[PDB]
Amino acid sequence: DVGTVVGIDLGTTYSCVGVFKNGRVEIIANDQGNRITPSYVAFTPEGERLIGDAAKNQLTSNPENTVFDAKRLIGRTWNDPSVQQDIKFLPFKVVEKKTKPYIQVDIGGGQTKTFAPEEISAMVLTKMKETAEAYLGKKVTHAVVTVPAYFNDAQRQATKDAGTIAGLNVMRIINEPTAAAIAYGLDKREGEKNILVFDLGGGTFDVSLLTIDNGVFEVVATNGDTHLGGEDFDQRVMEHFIKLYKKKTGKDVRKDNRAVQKLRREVEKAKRALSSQHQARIEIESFYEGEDFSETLTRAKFEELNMDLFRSTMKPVQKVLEDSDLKKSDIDEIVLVGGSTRIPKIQQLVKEFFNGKEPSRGINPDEAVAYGAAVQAGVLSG
Numbered sequence: 001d002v003g004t005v006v007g008i009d010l011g012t013t014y015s016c017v018g019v020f021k022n023g024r025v026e027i028i029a030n031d032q033g034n035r036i037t038p039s040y041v042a043f044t045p046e047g048e049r050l051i052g053d054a055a056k057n058q059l060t061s062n063p064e065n066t067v068f069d070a071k072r073l074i075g076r077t078w079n080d081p082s083v084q085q086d087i088k089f090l091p092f093k094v095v096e097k098k099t100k101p102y103i104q105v106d107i108g109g110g111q112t113k114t115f116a117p118e119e120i121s122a123m124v125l126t127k128m129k130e131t132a133e134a135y136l137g138k139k140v141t142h143a144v145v146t147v148p149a150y151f152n153d154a155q156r157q158a159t160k161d162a163g164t165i166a167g168l169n170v171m172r173i174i175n176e177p178t179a180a181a182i183a184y185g186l187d188k189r190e191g192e193k194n195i196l197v198f199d200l201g202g203g204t205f206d207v208s209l210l211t212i213d214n215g216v217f218e219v220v221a222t223n224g225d226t227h228l229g230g231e232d233f234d235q236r237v238m239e240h241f242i243k244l245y246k247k248k249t250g251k252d253v254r255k256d257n258r259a260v261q262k263l264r265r266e267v268e269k270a271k272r273a274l275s276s277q278h279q280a281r282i283e284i285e286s287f288y289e290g291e292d293f294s295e296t297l298t299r300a301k302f303e304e305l306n307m308d309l310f311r312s313t314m315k316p317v318q319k320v321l322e323d324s325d326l327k328k329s330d331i332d333e334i335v336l337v338g339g340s341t342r343i344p345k346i347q348q349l350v351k352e353f354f355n356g357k358e359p360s361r362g363i364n365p366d367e368a369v370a371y372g373a374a375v376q377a378g379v380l381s382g
């Protein structure tokens, strides 16, 4: 008895959980009313373990003991050059333990603890499991968990292990671009089709070329940029306003960490608003040295601030087409994945690259992967 199997998108920055109930996929909101949960864990000085929104919305006061991006370390050895590069940019301690990059944190009152990346991901998975259990009114024991198509054997096993620690029997490990394609019903098509999945997440950019033949998916080629995502677009806007504030007031905002967090929160909200509105206003009370911040951002300035980054997304799309021996016209379906794909310039750039071809539409791009996982979870629940 597998019970109600859950579909989990375990993302670098955000995670999503869905179930198949009363003939359809249900994406489940967490205890904070959010349909996506940050892949964050924080250990407060009192010793409280925070997971998700509570962990992320506290990150500024606790940078050493706030764990995130464990997905960059999962199933990798300590000496992996990717690990050695990534830990340079992580604020929490990472130590070699049992050949692996273990995360070291103060769990409260100076007591130090080490966690394998799969133990951190198990805490995120536990939060997803609780979110689904609150929704279903019953215990969840089985799951379908997605991973990037480039994940190797050790990375897929470590994701299954994270599940085991969380009390989830991960029945199927499925590729994130395949789950997105299933979400759009591209599996029940007929004949041979080439699917381009363009996945621009919060911190990663993944491009996958998939082939669908008689309902069977094959990942032909993968590319992207491991350090390009929505957060980089935020950072460009942060830089623009920190520069502007120094020009206007002569003050250096970054001297106050509390002032940068506040600007980060408002910049992110402004960015999201600019996907639908042509201008957003950032207002922050007692911003720096009791003085208030009031500035506006147009979609045009935002696009100009991020143009090189937006344009850089087209290079891995060209590399996957070459590595698949395909041309632009051979792409039958374009799947956009990640909240960042809601950016109008990103949607124009993809459409124009594929000479006017419209991408698949209807499912929230930030939920498409968990949606696909839930579709598969639905079949397995029977």
Ligand SMILES: Nc1ncnc2c1nc(N)n2[C@@H]1O[C@H](CO)[C@@H](O)[C@H]1O
Pocket (backbone or CB within 6 Å): 013, 014, 201, 202, 229, 230, 231, 268, 271, 272, 273, 275, 338, 339, 340, 341, 342, 343, 366
């Ligand atoms: N409507 C939107 N417009 C622009 N960016 C959006 C967005 N929605 C999300 N989630 N995002 C970004 O997706 C990433 C992961 O959640 C983050 O960088 C979000 O800001």
